[PDB]
Amino acid sequence: KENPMRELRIRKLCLNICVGESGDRLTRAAKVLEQLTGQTPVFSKARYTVRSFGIRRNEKIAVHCTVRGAKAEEILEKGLKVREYELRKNNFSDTGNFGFGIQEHIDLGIKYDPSIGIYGLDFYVVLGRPGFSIADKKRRTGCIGAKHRISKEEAMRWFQQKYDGIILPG
RNA sequence: GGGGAGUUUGACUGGGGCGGUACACCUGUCAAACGGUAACGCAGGUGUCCUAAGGCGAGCUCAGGGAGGACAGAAACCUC
Ligand SMILES: [Mg+2]
Ligand SMILES: [Mg+2]
């Protein structure tokens, strides 16, 4: 048997692009990201100052956004279609989440505009389960127990069964 | 305008002088489980800075570590 609603569902999908310098490149990356995600993304300032990468304290160097639900699985389907539903054993974290990256963006269904240029990005997905909001709600916060959490094997099974993908070793 | 006049040229202090400030303050210890308690005892700090680094209210949680993610690495950004 099974519990009808202890099943696995994706609860958020995070997209980010880290360009490493503020300016026209940054705002065009924000533009392509918001066109892809249908909503305005946000800028993240540099935490520290390191001159090896040519960055300083508190300038926007990356643009990221998060999605839930319908648009989340559509974007994830596009990304996995680009990655031909192929992932590696080490692509999955110990907490049940996973992710990957796309070297360039116009392949997943984005028209090439010569002005904006080309940009890669990182997809990440946080596998969830009904009741995970306990860990972050305000009134009576608590843990999510031991049985209810997600492990690497469960994430692998969910990926290979729902999206009929292949986990090549590596 | 030392030609001439009057006067002054601190204190502390293992003699005085040179050095130093133990000369006004602050922290720990000395200090002997109330408080107080000495030495040129020990380790140090002060003559500032702030329109917010003051005053309320709201919302968040930090250092670090582990596991993941294109360039990305020991270190850039995202997630748990
Ligand atoms: Mg005389
Ligand atoms: Mg006594």
Obtained via which technique? cryo-EM
User: What's the resolution in A?
Assistant: 2.9
| Distance from C-alpha of A92 to C-alpha of A151, rounded to nearest angstrom | 9
State residue A97 phi and psi, 5-degree precision. -80, 170
C-alpha to C-alpha distances, A30 to A3, A58, A72, nearest whole angstrom: 42, 18, 18
- State how far the Cα of A33 lies from the Cα of A17, in Å rounded to an integer: 8
Q: CB–CB of A32/A14 below 8 Å? A: no
Helices and strands, number each (H, E), in chain A = 3, 7
Q: How far does Cα A50 stand from its chain's mean position?
A: 26
Query: Would you say A162 and A80 are in contact if contact means Cβ atoms under 8 Å apart?
Result: no
Hey, which bits of chain A come out as E strands?
Answer: 9-18, 42-45, 60-67, 86-88, 98-102, 121-128, 166-168
Alpha-carbon Rg for chain A, nearest whole angstrom, is: 18
Encoded tokens for A161: 């069964």
Q: Which nucleotides of B are covered by protein (CB under 7 A)?
A: 59-60, 66-80
The Cα–Cα gap between A109 and A112 comes to 9
The DSSP result for A19-66, as a single string, is: -SS-SHHHHHHHHHHHHHHTS--EEEE-SS-BTTTTB-SS-EEEEEEE
Bridge partners (DSSP) listed for residue A161: none
CA dist A64 and A61 (Å) reads 10
| Strand B contacting residues by CB (7 Å) | A 12, 14, 16-20, 44, 46-48, 50, 52-55, 61-62, 64, 66, 88, 90-95, 97-104, 119-124, 126, 138
Q: Give the bridge partners for A60, in sequence order.
A: A45
